[PDB]
Amino acid sequence: TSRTHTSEVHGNAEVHASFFDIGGSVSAGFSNSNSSTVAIDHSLSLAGE
Amino acid sequence: TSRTHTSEVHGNAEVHASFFDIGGSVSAGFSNSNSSTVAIDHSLSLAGE
């Protein structure tokens, strides 16, 4: 089994360019995650000599 | 065999600075994924000492 925890910072930057319109943009953000993997495995090995 | 639950929490933020039509959007997020992953392996080895 595996349980995780993530952090993140986000950003964006885009300005406008038209015949009349100008602009600008900034941002933020914090993202996380909680992944719960439950892995069930089986194996076989048949060796000879 | 593996069946994975990946829960997510998240926070989001955007803005668009302009003259008078300035737009902003802070936000968040919540998500899960029910990912059932199987994997079938067949292998070999030929060792000689």
Residue numbers in the entry:
A (entry chain B), B (entry chain C): 295 to 343
Question: Could you pull the original sentences from the published paper?
Answer:
Following assembly, the anthrax protective antigen (PA) forms an oligomeric translocon that unfolds and translocates either its lethal factor (LF) or edema factor (EF) into the host cell. Within the endosomal compartment, the acidic environment induces a conformational change in the PA, resulting in the formation of a β-barrel channel that can insert itself into the endosomal membrane. The first α helix and β strand of LF and EF unfold and dock into a deep amphipathic cleft, called the α clamp, which resides at the interface of two PA monomers.
The available space on the heptameric PA channel for EF binding can only accommodate up to three EF molecules due to steric hindrance. Indeed, 2D classification of cryo-EM images of PA channel bound with EF showed that the EF binding varies in different classes, suggesting that the space is not fully occupied. Therefore, we used a symmetry expansion method in Relion for 3D classification and were able to resolve the asymmetrically attached EF. Upon PA binding, these disordered residues of EF (residues 20–30) refold into an α-helix (EFN α1) and bind within the α-clamp site. LF α1 is angled downward towards the pore in the α-clamp site, while the amino-terminal end of EF α1 is elevated ~2.9 Å as measured using the carbonyl groups on LF Glu34 and EF Glu24. This elevation in EF α1 appears to be caused by a change in the orientation of PAN Phe464. This change in the orientation of Phe464 appears to restrict EF α1 in its elevated conformation in the α-clamp site. While in the PA7-bound EF structures, the HD domain contributes to a new conformation by bridging the PABD and ACD.
